[PDB]
Symmetry: C4
Subunit: 223 residues, 4 copies
Amino acid sequence: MLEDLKRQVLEANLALPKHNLVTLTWGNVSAVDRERGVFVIKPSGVDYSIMTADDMVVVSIETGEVVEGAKKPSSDTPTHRLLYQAFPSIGGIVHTHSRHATIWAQAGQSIPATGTTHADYFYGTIPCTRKMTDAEINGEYEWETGNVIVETFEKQGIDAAQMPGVLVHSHGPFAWGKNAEDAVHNAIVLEEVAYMGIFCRQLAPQLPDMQQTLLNKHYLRKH
Amino acid sequence: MLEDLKRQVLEANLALPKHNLVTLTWGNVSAVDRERGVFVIKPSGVDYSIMTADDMVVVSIETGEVVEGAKKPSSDTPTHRLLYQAFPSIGGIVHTHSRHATIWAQAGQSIPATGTTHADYFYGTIPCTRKMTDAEINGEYEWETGNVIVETFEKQGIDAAQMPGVLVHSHGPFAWGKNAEDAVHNAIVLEEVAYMGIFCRQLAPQLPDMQQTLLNKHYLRKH
Amino acid sequence: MLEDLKRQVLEANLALPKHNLVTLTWGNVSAVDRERGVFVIKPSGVDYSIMTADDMVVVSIETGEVVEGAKKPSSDTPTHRLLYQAFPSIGGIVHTHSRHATIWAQAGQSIPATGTTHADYFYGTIPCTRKMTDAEINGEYEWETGNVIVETFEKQGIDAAQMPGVLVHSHGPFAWGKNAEDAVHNAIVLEEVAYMGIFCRQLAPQLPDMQQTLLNKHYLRKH
Amino acid sequence: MLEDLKRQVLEANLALPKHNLVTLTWGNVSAVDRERGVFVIKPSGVDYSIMTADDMVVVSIETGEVVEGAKKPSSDTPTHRLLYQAFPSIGGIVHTHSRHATIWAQAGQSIPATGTTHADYFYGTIPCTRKMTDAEINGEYEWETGNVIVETFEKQGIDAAQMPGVLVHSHGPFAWGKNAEDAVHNAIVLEEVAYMGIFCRQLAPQLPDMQQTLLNKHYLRKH
Ligand SMILES: [Zn+2]
Ligand SMILES: [Zn+2]
Ligand SMILES: [Zn+2]
Ligand SMILES: [Zn+2]
């Protein structure tokens, strides 16, 4: 019912292993169609090497119910849905356990902006959420994961439109963008600055965050 | 005599270099057939690029004697055999010297669970064995290596069915699963969490193990 | 108007992703033609996988105006131009955000010469610039970036002909050479010594710079 | 005049980039023919992608003079020659600047045996030479590099037949074996244990060298 969207989401998902952001069947990408009040997401239980546009699943933003698709949607669907509802500006969402972004997530630390590479895509510190409560973990887990992300941005006054990424404590990264492709790009850059962030810290443990002026020059220039 | 099993084991072995879990001729995979009281394992002295299903060797679980095969079985056969005998639930075993899991093994330290990636495959700390005694090293080495692994799980009260992996002090990782393929997957994830475990420790040297609730949510959800 | 030069610059740019010096669309290479008072540089907004020799842009060294080309030149053109004007000897320039060189840049530290690998291409410490002032960042940024590089070499008395590389604080590496190809080679070696520099420091935090005699033997031997 | 040897040496050299032991034109492999009193080595100034068996150069062990070949021999020829003369048992030599072995070399530290991976190929600590004197550096450099290696093994009482590798302070690794292929294998394993050696140290800074019994079990088993 949204063949082109399914194609985009299919290609985005296929891009995950190509850019070494994932292994086995981890990761998932989705793209939204606000007008139709629905979003397309990777299916659960399908290898990337067999995946076809038909395997993509269409889900209702409002009810989280599957509108079209023979396969079961990704188990992360609730988190995606919550995010689309909470952040109006986003059009695509990417979830992976890319090694270095995940390393920061497991360490429960935020990735500070120390380079223009980072400044070009994330306006400031890429936030890491607080740990989830037992109530949250044992309740509607995936949906609750989404709430913890939204809470992180709200309590810290950060605009989801200027920070297309977040690290979920002890879990991994979540990125988003204008569309499926854009989200994938932010996901790869997120992994990139996560990697460089580890070693530049090692070289300079007391390195201060980059100059606000430089951060502004780069982020505001684009966007 | 077990053509399909030989095919599975052949493919599993071939997967080792594809996933960069090994170099040269290191590593070996085997799968069991309880009813026939036998297991199929990689041959010793054969490059992965020349290996064929016929090269796989069939070995008796009870006697450790070669039941069928023109080639010599992997020198690690005794360890595999011991493990099949000791852990009834396992159907496949993988041994590699994958860089990061091996780094932990040489450091003689256990990989703590600090992420959901880990929680999805290993129910808790991936154990590292104690050093082997000179008696053990100079006796039936490979067989004794198997005993040290079993002893590790017993003295620490860990269920082999919930912890499909172990690190042998100063040597390398050993993984297992329901079958050849499943064992290979656990082997690759083991390497993965080993890698992330190194750097998340660097970022947070005092990082506590992940929340028991989160560990439970993830491991118990599957399995 | 300089088909062969465009070919060289096209190939050089295409080499960036091949040698894993870049991702997405980052990076850019240019080569000069002193006699014609012009230089050819990568275009802005074109994927490496679609790039053709026609996409290359010809720019005036003196006016920085586009002499030929349907596409917009790289946003880094001003930095390139400034460098060609300031350093007469250079014939090619490469800019990338290659992970390890960039790690040093974000750490704001210079890469010391600790190996003959380094000695063969850089005569001494590969300099990292000071931070740029707000005036510089908010003025003609790219052009000013070039000035900060030149100032670095002048105040430190380093000959651009013996040090084909520099790290721009919080940004990334810039390399150059006799031509497009030569610059690319220096860029890859720069990344290489940046990588080894990180870990040899970890192994030996108090390691002194390599023997001046060894540095001289290697650099002076070639060049 | 030794077509088969030239083929072997050609393939060995070509293996260097395949196993990521080198970049650009670094590295070189040679194999000897004691009876003919000559050795075949990679040529200087030829890309790996263009190299053919004819490009290999034949050199006299006794005079170091080129016996056959249109191209100039590797600038490292003297070091190779010296080594063949000093160590009768070796039949092949490999020199590379493989990242991790080179990291140890630049740090001027020896790689301790902490794993069976290492034990299978190197009987003990892989030695790193002392720094070379100015007299040595400014004299017959390459030949002198060979002398420093031999001196290292002699003063430390280490048998070249049991330690197919060495690190030259501030330079890089040198490996050898029964033949070209065997030397290449030792070179790749040397890089491997160098890599793991870096991080297992990070995990366990006070980790003692592996048990002598385990080292013996593994090295003596083979060889
Ligand atoms: Zn996840
Ligand atoms: Zn082993
Ligand atoms: Zn840049
Ligand atoms: Zn060298």
